[PDB]
Design an enzyme around this catalytic site. Structure first.
Site, short mmCIF file in Angstrom:
data_model
loop_
_atom_site.label_atom_id
_atom_site.label_comp_id
_atom_site.label_asym_id
_atom_site.label_seq_id
_atom_site.Cartn_x
_atom_site.Cartn_y
_atom_site.Cartn_z
N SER A 178 -81.09 23.61 70.91
CA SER A 178 -80.53 24.15 72.94
C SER A 178 -80.78 25.54 72.63
CB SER A 178 -79.00 24.08 72.82
OG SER A 178 -78.65 24.66 73.74
N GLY A 179 -81.22 26.44 73.35
CA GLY A 179 -81.88 27.32 73.66
C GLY A 179 -82.98 27.93 73.25
N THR A 183 -86.74 23.67 78.71
CA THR A 183 -86.32 23.31 80.49
C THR A 183 -87.50 24.72 80.54
OG1 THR A 183 -84.27 23.24 79.53
CG2 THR A 183 -85.31 23.26 81.53
N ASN A 225 -78.62 28.82 74.82
CA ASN A 225 -79.09 29.74 75.93
C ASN A 225 -77.80 29.42 77.26
OD1 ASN A 225 -81.17 29.89 77.41
ND2 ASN A 225 -81.59 27.92 77.56
N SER A 228 -79.28 26.53 79.68
CA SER A 228 -79.86 25.06 79.02
C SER A 228 -79.30 24.29 79.60
CB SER A 228 -78.55 25.38 77.83
OG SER A 228 -77.42 25.32 77.70
N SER A 229 -79.98 23.23 79.70
CA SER A 229 -80.09 21.53 79.92
C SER A 229 -79.64 21.61 79.59
CB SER A 229 -81.90 21.06 80.03
OG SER A 229 -82.22 21.46 81.36
N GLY A 451 -81.45 19.15 73.97
CA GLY A 451 -81.66 19.68 72.57
C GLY A 451 -80.77 19.80 71.13
N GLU A 453 -77.81 20.76 68.06
CA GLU A 453 -77.16 21.48 68.74
C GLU A 453 -76.06 21.62 67.26
OE1 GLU A 453 -75.65 21.68 72.79
OE2 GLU A 453 -77.43 21.01 73.19
#
Ligand code: ADP
Ligand code: XB2
Ligand code: MG
Lengths: 900, 50
Positions: A178-179, A183, A225, A228-229, A451, A453
């Site tokens: 993540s982040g 995306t 993020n 984040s998606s 992502g 995490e």
């Protein structure tokens, strides 16, 4: 570099300046003395050798600290001539600090993209570079990875070139925690294809809006993020045989439906809710009964509600325009806004225990009244169905009275289900637009999984997203290290298997297999009396002493409520077992789903139309379908790495970056790309495509087997022959050859299209030359005509008699010759063309006479076709009559057996 | 890997060794038979002194 001017203002943020080129040749550096040494606070630090003592060495680090380490742990520094190279596969010394510092020196200068051979690493800038506006897209059109500086647009166009050349589906596989940046790179891919498809219309703007339309409903601010998606997306951009954009399909894999109702500190719910609320747009603040501030909505107020990276006032207007560009009519856009308003009010419904029934009831209904008004439902019927939901056991239905503790879960899951399916419909509607029914054959599937995490509290979703990363990581490991050498053996390449240790099949099997976590969830959800302790018990009994990656929890942060730890590729992850059975089983309120089908809003009925199959089962089969569909495509990987937890641009934490560099196998992937044979061509497509490189090596008009032809052509290329080996059905090349071959081919195509133009201009100029000479020669005849008259302006007897008409036989008989011939020749024409026209009609009548007779026979033949077709239908109906009598007797006897 | 249509896009199916052998037989037959009927149609395109 003078060629950098083509990017305009974006150029300083993609490639190093000319001064950095000159500084490199002047840096103080000694290849034998400069080395990296490990350190405590930071994984590696530069150091200078000061002495040699046999097997023990001593050196002074850049901070003047003394260190002693054995030679087995010291790595030589890369010379400054290779600093900041755009592709890390070209590094001379490859090790953990060489990649760490190669990323750090580039990222500190905002050059965020860098290749790593077959895949590329992008480091999150946290501060914008004007590297994403329309002008750079034109600079990336048709440029190759050798030409353009590393960027997500480079990978996108490279994939497009492969898609049209191979006529095979391609893939761009972006991965990371993540982040890290997957995306925004995905959006950039979408905007790339759109702008190129429009400049190189309505559809191109529509596709550009296809991202922010979904991103408003699918993204959220997280600790990692701001955007984040929370859902994995696979976007297939389809092109016609001519290569122009023809359609786009959006596919979604796993929306974090629980995020709609629960968020940790330092993170947001989905962006749609706060972007609608922030503009306080009167038309929406009138349609949606959300006139208040976001700080009172329990679901979305927790964490942080505002982020500096997002101008929340503009994102609302961006989504309104996005729906307008995608052709969402007023009823569609209004309905989905109404649904988000309902979802927002849905978090404020309060439930309390009835004083005597031990059952929940709504304490406040104004938010439910608002929701049902927006959704076109009945507020009383909705609350009754939530308070007294009916459950079924086969065909029999029975009412179960809900407690407060389980209704809160049930309502959360309901919010999850409505949001999830509304997002799915929005996807199918975006696939309903963009679909132009035009010729379609090839697509580029861009993958942006949720992502990897590590929160302070990870749940079943955190496992599903980690498993999704772990599967794509195992796919990357397989393609680069396993399948690569396995296909070498299949292709008979003289290659020695190298074990890199990058394998996750054991831990994936620990989850997938009929003894793994997912099968346990798949059976424990069936037991009506199962509990978190029963699941934890069976989980432990099944795995303690039986799994190397399953371990006792660490509970270093205290709070030992219920935990275990899992050795993922990307680190030790502590999972909380509470609630995983509910989260997987997906118990939806059958009444509310039935009302959704019954909704007065056409949209809400569409969302739940056509409503055992737990989310773990659906995800596992969906992801196995994905990765099977992906193994049937040519992959380009993109590794997003987050440089800093404090989100400060240019700040970089070396241990946290190294942890991701290690876990994504970037070093191992380079080891195989440098040593192995990553490039491969079928002998037929090789011959077809690169025959333009040397048509004489493969003379056509004569047969030559695919193997010996490729042998002669590649031997003729005069490139280093140690770079390739031949397989049973594919030719195999070292890492750096294929790029050079595409450079060579486009240089030749330029040479040839200019030399064919040499011919085109040469013969077109010949046509001009000959037409000019013949026309001027005729003009010379015209000049002779006038010169002749001046010659004739002399005085002979004939000058008087020829010009005026008195002479009988000369003027009169020639006039008879000219008049008679004029009449004869004109009629001659007319007569010959007429005679031909009469013949032509005769030939038409002869052929029509044959066709009229054959047609007369054919009408009798057709009447026989009618008799055939009528008797066929008649016998099918009679047989159906007897067959109906058969099923009548059978179904009767089956019912009699059911009665007995 | 013959291409078959599913909606507007074509999908790819992997063939068995027996069924690729049978498909190569069918291609041999249908090229032969069409080559024969074309040869007849060319005979019928001569044989015509108009
Ligand atoms: N290439 C980039 N340019 C500008 N900002 C970026 C970039 N990559 C990441 N960001 C930062 O993070 C967000 C975009 O990253 P994103 O790709 O959504 O991360 P992930 O995909 O890992 O969730 C932006 O809001 C910004 O804060
Ligand atoms: C293994 C993979 C990276 N690969 C190749 O190595 C080459 C492919 N196709 C050839 C024909 C080609 C080369 C360069 C650009 C376009 C196409 N396909 C591929 O799938
Ligand atoms: Mg993202």
């Amino acid at each position: 570099d003078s060629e950098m001017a083509v990017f305009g203002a974006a150029a300083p943020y993609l490639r190093k300046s000319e001064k950095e080129r000159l500084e490199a040749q002047t840096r103080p550096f000694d290849l034998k003395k400069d080395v990296f040494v490990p350190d405590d606070k930071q994984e590696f630090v530069k150091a200078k050798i000061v002495s040699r003592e046999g097997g023990k060495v001593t050196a002074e680090t850049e901070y003047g600290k003394t260190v002693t380490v054995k030679e087995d742990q010291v790595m030589q520094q890369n010379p400054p001539k290779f600093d900041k190279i755009e592709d890390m596969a070209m590094l001379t010394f490859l090790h953990e600090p060489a990649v760490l510092y190669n990323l750090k020196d580039r990222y500190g200068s905002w050059m965020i993209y860098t290749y790593s051979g077959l895949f590329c690493v992008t480091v999150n800038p946290y501060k914008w570079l004007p590297v994403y506006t329309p002008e750079v897209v034109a600079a990336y059109r048709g440029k190759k990875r050798s030409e353009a500086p590393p960027h997500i647009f480079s990978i996108s166009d490279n994939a497009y070139q492969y898609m049209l050349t191979d006529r095979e589906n391609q893939s761009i596989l972006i991965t990371g925690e993540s982040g890290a940046g997957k995306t925004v790179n995905t959006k950039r891919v979408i905007q790339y294809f759109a702008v190129i498809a429009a400049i190189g219309g309505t559809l191109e703007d529509q596709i550009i809006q296809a991202n922010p339309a979904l991103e408003a409903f699918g993204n959220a601010k997280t600790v990692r993020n701001d955007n984040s998606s929370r859902f994995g997306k696979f976007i297939r951009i389809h092109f016609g045989a001519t290569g122009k954009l023809a359609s786009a399909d959006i596919e979604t894999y796993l929306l974090e439906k629980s995020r709609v109702i629960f968020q940790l500190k330092a993170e947001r719910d989905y962006h749609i809710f706060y972007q609608i609320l922030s503009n306080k747009k009167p038309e929406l603040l009138d349609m949606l009964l959300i006139t208040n501030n976001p700080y009172d909505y329990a679901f979305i107020s927790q964490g942080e509600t505002t982020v500096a990276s997002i101008d929340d006032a503009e994102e609302l207007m961006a989504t309104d325009n996005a729906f307008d560009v995608l052709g969402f009519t007023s009823e569609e856009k209004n309905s989905m806004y109404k649904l988000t308003g309902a979802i927002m009010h849905f978090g404020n419904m309060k439930f309390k225990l009835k004083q005597r029934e031990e059952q929940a009831e709504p304490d406040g209904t104004e938010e439910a009244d608002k929701s049902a008004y927006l959704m076109g439902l009945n507020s009383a019927d909705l609350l009754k169905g939530l308070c007294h939901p009916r459950v079924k056991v086969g065909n029999e239905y029975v009412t179960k009275g809900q407690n407060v503790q389980q209704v809160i879960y049930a309502t959360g899951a309901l919010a999850k289900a409505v949001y999830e399916r509304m997002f799915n419909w929005m996807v199918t509607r975006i696939n309903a637009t963009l679909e132009t029914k035009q010729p379609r054959q090839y697509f580029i599937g861009v993958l942006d999984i949720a992502g990897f995490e590590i929160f302070d509290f990870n749940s079943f979703e955190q496992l599903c997203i980690n498993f999704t990363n772990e599967k794509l990581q195992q796919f990357f490991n397989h393609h680069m290290f396993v399948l690569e050498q396995e296909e070498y053996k299949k292709e008979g390449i003289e290659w020695t298997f190298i074990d890199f240790g990058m394998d996750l099949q054991a831990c994936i099997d620990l989850i997938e297999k009929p003894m793994g976590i997912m099968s346990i969830l798949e059976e424990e959800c069936m037991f009506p009396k199962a509990t978190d302790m029963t699941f934890k018990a069976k989980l432990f009994d099944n795995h303690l002493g039986k799994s190397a990656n399953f371990q006792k929890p660490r509970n270093i942060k205290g709070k030992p409520e219920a935990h275990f730890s899992l050795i993922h590729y990307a680190g030790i992850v502590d999972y909380n077992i509470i609630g995983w059975l509910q989260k997987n089983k997906d118990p939806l309120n059958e009444t509310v789903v039935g009302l959704y089908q019954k909704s007065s809003l056409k949209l809400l009925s569409t969302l739940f139309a056509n409503y055992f199959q737990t989310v773990s089962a659906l995800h596992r089969e969906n992801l196995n379908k994905l990765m099977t569909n992906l193994r049937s495509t040519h992959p380009h990987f993109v590794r997003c790495i987050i440089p800093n937890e404090t989100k400060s641009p240019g700040v970089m934490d070396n241990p946290l970056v190294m942890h991701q560099l290690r876990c994504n196998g970037v070093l191992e992937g380079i080891r195989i790309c440098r040593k192995g044979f990553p490039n491969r061509i079928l002998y037929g497509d090789f011959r077809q495509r690169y025959r333009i490189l040397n048509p004489a090596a493969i003379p056509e008009g004569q047969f030559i087997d695919s193997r010996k032809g490729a042998e002669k052509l590649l031997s003729s290329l005069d490139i280093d022959h140690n770079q390739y080996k031949f397989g049973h059905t594919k030719v195999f090349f070292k890492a750096g050859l294929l790029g050079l071959l595409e450079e060579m081919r486009d240089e030749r195509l330029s040479r040839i299209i200019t030399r064919i133009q040499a011919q085109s201009r040469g013969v077109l100029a010949r046509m001009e030359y000959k037409k000019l000479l013949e026309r001027r020669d005729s003009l010379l005849v015209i000049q002779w005509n006038i010169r002749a008259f001046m010659g004739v302006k002399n005085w002979p007897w004939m000058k008087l008699y020829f010009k005026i008409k008195p002479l009988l036989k000369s003027a009169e008989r020639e006039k008879e010759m000219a008049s008679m011939k004029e009449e004869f020749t004109r009629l001659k024409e007319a007569l010959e063309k007429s005679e031909a026209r009469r013949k032509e009609l005769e030939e038409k009548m002869v052929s029509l006479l044959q066709e009229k007779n054959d047609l007369q026979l054919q009408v009798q033949a057709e009447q026989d076709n009618l008799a055939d077709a009528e008797e066929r239908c008649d016998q099918l109906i009679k047989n159906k009559i007897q067959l109906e009598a058969k099923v009548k007797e059978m179904n009767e006897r089956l019912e009699d057996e059911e009665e007995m």
